[PDB]
Design a protein around this nucleic acid. Structure first.
Ligand SMILES: [Zn+2]
Ligand SMILES: [Zn+2]
Ligand SMILES: [Zn+2]
Ligand SMILES: [Zn+2]
Ligand SMILES: [Zn+2]
Ligand SMILES: [Zn+2]
Lengths: 84, 85, 88
DNA sequence: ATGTCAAGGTCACCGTGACCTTTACG
DNA sequence: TCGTAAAGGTCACGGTGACCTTGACA
């Protein structure tokens, strides 16, 4: 039974920032935390976040990232790659 | 004294594009959509706020608001001819 | 010596659709393939395509795109965003 | 000539996401 | 040493919107 991304249901590439995540959501989470980006939902904060959509609601995708367990502490301030 | 506003997002309208008081941003979005027969889907309940800030957020609701407000798909030329009118 | 666009000679922004291309030619190629746009040359199919004249002849600019090596397979029909595309 | 208007085209800029690079660790 | 997981980085795709070109008309 293969591991799926807890954020968009796409095939997870590993355990990024604490959760079973895919490359797309991993990069989205990294970009948001790195740039302290703030998003706003145009609807009622419950948009469907799935890989079937070419584009997702950024606000709901980032909120789903936190809801599913992605830790902002996993995104490095010192921009260093590799290591645990 | 106030400027005419875009019926789709409330940005300052640049003229009457495809039948309605529209801005350059919505005019191009409508043109691109019709020209490319682009199909969008709403992640929420088809009632996203389409403002100058939020217009990029939901393409499906923005295109539906275009049609709701009166933009005519017949205004997007199939022969792609500039000028005239 | 920054890389030049093989289509108009403007400063290339990267490798768009296989060739060292600028943003202007990348968008022109994308628009054309996406819409299956067919152009006609008003002069004699040999207009000079440069940074200052690229907008003059669409027919010659598109033909130069193909001549220099731009791949129509690089333009996504499904309009999927980002990532890396496959070629053959 | 020049101004208006509204059509299509152009292109600088930016987010994205597959894949690439770099690690520490077992 | 070596395979592997997981951090950040790369960069070429697509979408957007300000502004440009055009052509009828006054
Ligand atoms: Zn995902
Ligand atoms: Zn949302
Ligand atoms: Zn608008
Ligand atoms: Zn919507
Ligand atoms: Zn060019
Ligand atoms: Zn020509």
């Amino acid at each position: 039974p293969k591991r799926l991304c807890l954020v968009c249901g796409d095939v997870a590439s590993g355990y990024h920032y604490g959760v079973a995540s895919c490359e797309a959501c991993k990069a989205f989470f990294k970009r948001t935390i790195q740039g302290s980006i703030e998003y706003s939902c145009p609807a009622s904060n419950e948009c469907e976040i799935t890989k079937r959509r070419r584009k997702a609601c950024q606000a709901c995708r980032f909120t789903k990232c936190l809801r599913v367990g992605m830790l902002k502490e996993g995104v490095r301030l010192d921009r260093v790659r590799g290591g645990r």
